[PDB]
């Protein structure tokens, strides 16, 4: 159901090594709003050797409405395919709204580590991301 308070969904990015810009999952509905996983390579000019995986949760970004807001908790996880006990996750808490409709980690993990076959996150050039999102009832959506 769309109005559920929480959900866990995964997003697998294929040909991960070739990613150059943000890739987005299809929407997953929680608390009557659409949520997406956004993944992108990131780097900063002062640390050109430290390219990272950027990993964000995005809420209701297809809307340009300035009225909506939704506070959510989430666990942002990259799945270790070799050992499910070696997956890596980091927690967030954020009021989502138009000006800040995503939240997560620009420097989630080093790109060189996620793409290292020996580390267990990448297989057949595929990396799987997962979000467990626990959202509050939104405001500014229903009349």
């Amino acid at each position: 159901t769309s109005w559920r308070s929480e959900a866990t969904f995964q997003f697998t990015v294929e040909r991960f090594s070739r990613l150059s810009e943000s890739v987005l999952s299809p929407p997953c509905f929680v608390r009557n709003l659409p949520w997406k996983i956004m993944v992108m390579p990131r780097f900063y000019p002062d640390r050109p050797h430290q390219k990272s995986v950027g990993f964000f949760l995005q809420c209701n970004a297809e809307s340009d409405s300035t009225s909506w807001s939704c506070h959510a908790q989430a666990v942002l996880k990259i799945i270790n395919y070799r050992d499910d006990e070696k997956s890596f996750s980091r927690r967030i808490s954020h009021l989502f709204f138009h000006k800040e409709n995503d939240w997560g980690f620009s420097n989630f993990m080093a790109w060189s580590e996620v793409t290292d076959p020996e580390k267990g996150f990448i297989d057949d050039d595929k990396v799987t991301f997962e979000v467990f999102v626990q959202a509050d009832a939104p405001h500014g959506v229903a009349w």
Partner: peptide, 15 residues
Amino acid sequence: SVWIPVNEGASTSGM
């Protein structure tokens, strides 16, 4: 084991 506090290093994407 989950130890790192919520939001450590968190931000918007800037997109």
